[PDB]
Amino acid sequence: DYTAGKEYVELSSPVPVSQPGKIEVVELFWYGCPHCYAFEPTIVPWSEKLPADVHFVRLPALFGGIWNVHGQMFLTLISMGVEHDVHNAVFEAIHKEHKKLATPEEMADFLAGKGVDKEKFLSTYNSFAIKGQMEKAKKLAMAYQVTGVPTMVVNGKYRFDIGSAGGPEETLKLADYLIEKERAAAK
Ligand SMILES: Cc1ccccc1CSc1nncn1N
């Protein structure tokens, strides 16, 4: 019952997906974004209930300044295989504890409190691989033509956000609908 152009738009140039063969769902976010923080209790449980042919990805929006710093922290944690376990703690630190997490040294100190290897965090943060991932994330956001967060993209093809869908639960119902649209498509 959704209308292309209203609750979601279709990208005229679809973007490749991270895991070919699965229906991708991307949430573009920034740890410091209050709406992103407020969306977490809705999107997190939904993301954990997704079927086997769907691949949920968080992608930091690297829109400059502190967004890039926090995004680089995110990618470092993903690379280390620890982001899932400290995800909520980072949001809480920033929004409830008023921690800035604005330099790698501050990040490492905080994250060590959550069990994250400090030396490995710092080495990874400054690594060439993370530089490459930052550039890829920037190029992806440009391709999605995203200008704010949180924003969802399904299968590199459909872009929508909380405002366009009409609320947080509505956003995920819309995601479900678009996932079904893609599952039904011929390949
Ligand atoms: C490509 C990258 C860079 C940085 C972090 C995570 C990723 C994987 S996400 C992705 N890759 N191709 C489409 N798409 N959504």
Author numbering: 5 to 191
Which lines from the publication concern this structure?
Enzymes that catalyze disulfide bond formation in the periplasm of many Gram-negative bacteria are essential for virulence. Consequently PaDsbA1 is a highly significant control point affecting the function of many downstream virulence effector molecules and as such is a potential target for inhibitor development. As with other DsbA enzymes, the catalytic surface of PaDsbA1 is composed of a CPHC active site, and three neighbouring surface loops that determine redox character as well as the nature of interactions with substrates and the partner protein DsbB.
For all crystallization experiments we used the E82I variant of PaDsbA1. In both the X-ray structure and the HADDOCK models of the complex, Fragment 1 is positioned at an interface between the thioredoxin (TRX) and helical domains of PaDsbA1, on the non-catalytic face of the enzyme. Fragment 1 bound to PaDsbA1 at the end of this groove adjacent to helix H6. The amino-triazole ring of Fragment 1 binds into a pocket that is formed by residues Tyr148, Ser22 and Glu28, where it is sandwiched between the surface formed by helix H6, the B2 sheet and B1-B2 connecting loop The ortho-methylbenzene group is positioned close to the interface of H6 and H2 of the helical domain. In the crystal structure however, the majority of observable contacts between PaDsbA1 and Fragment 1 are to this amino-triazole group for which the electron density map is sharply resolved. Specifically Fragment 1 is coordinated by two side-chain mediated hydrogen bonds between the amino substituent of the triazole ring and residues Glu28 (2.99 Å) and Tyr148 (2.92 Å). Additional stabilization is provided by a π-stacking interaction between the triazole ring and amide bond of Val21 –Ser22 (3.55 Å from centroid to Ser22 Cα). Electron density for the ortho-methylbenzene group is less well defined in the X-ray structure presumably the result of a degree of flexibility. The crystal structure of PaDsbA1 undergoes very minor conformational changes upon fragment binding.
